[PDB]
Amino acid sequence: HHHHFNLPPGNYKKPKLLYCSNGGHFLRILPDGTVDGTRDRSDQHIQLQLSAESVGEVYIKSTETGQYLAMDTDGLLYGSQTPNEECLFLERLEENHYNTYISKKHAEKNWFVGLKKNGSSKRGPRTHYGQKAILFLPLPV
Ligand code: NA
Numbered sequence: 001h002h003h004h005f006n007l008p009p010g011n012y013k014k015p016k017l018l019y020c021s022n023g024g025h026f027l028r029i030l031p032d033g034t035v036d037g038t039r040d041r042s043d044q045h046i047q048l049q050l051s052a053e054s055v056g057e058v059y060i061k062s063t064e065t066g067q068y069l070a071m072d073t074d075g076l077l078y079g080s081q082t083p084n085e086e087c088l089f090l091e092r093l094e095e096n097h098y099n100t101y102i103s104k105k106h107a108e109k110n111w112f113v114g115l116k117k118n119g120s121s122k123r124g125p126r127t128h129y130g131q132k133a134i135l136f137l138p139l140p141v
Contacts, residue, residue: 022132023117035077037119075124098135
């Protein structure tokens, strides 16, 4: 365990939007497997179904395309057709409020899901604790 275990409240019963307060983007998994953020609440690719593997581990799945959020070996977020080790994230409470998502595969490197202010996703190595890009709020769809 390389990380704390403060867990966020709530559950996985319903799909969520993952809203990044940094730039005010919803995490988006595009059909072509690219991942970014959009401020467009009506975007069909921001509806995400999270599900638990182990406690505090999640898959994050596009409801629209079925793609799993994943982070590849070079820290790039992508949409995976099938769940693999790159698709597991450690979902944690952060700053007593937000959700963060650390790549389980790369947890020892503290690679987070993050969106920059311009809506582009962060590359894993460019993320770290303390950033704004990594802070998400799950919103109802
Ligand atoms: Na894949």
